[PDB]
Design a protein around this ligand. Sequence first.
Ligand SMILES: O=C(NC[C@H]1C[C@@H](NC(=O)[C@@H]2C[C@H](F)CN2)CN1C(=O)C1CC1)c1ccc(C#Cc2ccc(CN3CCOCC3)cc2)cc1Cl
Ligand SMILES: [Zn+2]
Length: 297
Amino acid sequence: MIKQRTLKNIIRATGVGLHSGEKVYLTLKPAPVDTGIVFSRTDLDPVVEIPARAENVGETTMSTTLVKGDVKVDTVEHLLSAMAGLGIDNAYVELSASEVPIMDGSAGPFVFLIQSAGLQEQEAAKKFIRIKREVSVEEGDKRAVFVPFDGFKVSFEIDFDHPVFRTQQASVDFSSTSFVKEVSRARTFGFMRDIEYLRSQNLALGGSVENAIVVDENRVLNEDGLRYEDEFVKHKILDAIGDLYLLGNSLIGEFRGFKSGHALNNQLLRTLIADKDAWEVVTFEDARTAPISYMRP
Ligand SMILES: O=C(NC[C@H]1C[C@@H](NC(=O)[C@@H]2C[C@H](F)CN2)CN1C(=O)C1CC1)c1ccc(C#Cc2ccc(CN3CCOCC3)cc2)cc1Cl
Ligand SMILES: [Zn+2]
């Protein structure tokens, strides 16, 4: 039977917030059965805890933000991506500040920290949301879709009118392709012109080539270049996997993005939750006959 997983050991990590430019201390802790992923602002008295759930998403412009009163946690989607890919159900994310550290721009540092610590099976069935019906949202030229699928799969397409865009489409069946190998190293990215402006408005204060792909009109300015021919669309998939995890249960089904982002990914989540005709919660008495598979712990 497919069981809930938490961390075996606690993980301590250090970084900077992409927007805040603030140094932040990160502690990942095991958690009991049926906790979910809970973000916890330990710099406050009293300490403030926001479950990583679609109900707790704030104004979706720069990144995925969790909110509870006037306390926020900025840029959760990369860490949540990492935890999704390794199948982590239960964990406490402690932060000494408002923003999750950016690390290298990818999920890879987070995935390493998690597997280093190790994972622990817990005595309870894992709960899965299975897409039963197509559910689709559009706004202008953007679109984001759930389609039933005996497994877990994400496709994405982007279209920037810009010399640097290379492959702008990709699809990954995560039951036959490794999240760790193929998606987790995909780095966030930013246009020279936007970054010059946004910096001027006290935004992206922690950005650098050390944590972002920087791009002028013509080329990646990063000296050692890209990790993947298709890094940009691969990062969109990585962000999508994070936002999907705000459902609070692992997904059996497929996600398709067309120029989508946090805002419309969040509309799709809300529209899916709202239409109980479109999904069901299932468990599995036998892994050998389940449509998705997990690594050994
Ligand atoms: O938000 C950013 N990019 C959004 C990109 C990535 C995708 N979103 C994601 O990945 C989501 C959203 C979040 F990004 C995380 N997850 C979607 N997307 C788009 O579609 C873009 C709109 C086209 C971003 C990235 C890097 C910097 C930056 C920076 C930077 C880099 C270098 C320097 C140069 N300095 C030189 C001196 O040393 C310090 C650095 C300064 C700032 C600033 C920003 Cl504002
Ligand atoms: Zn991202």
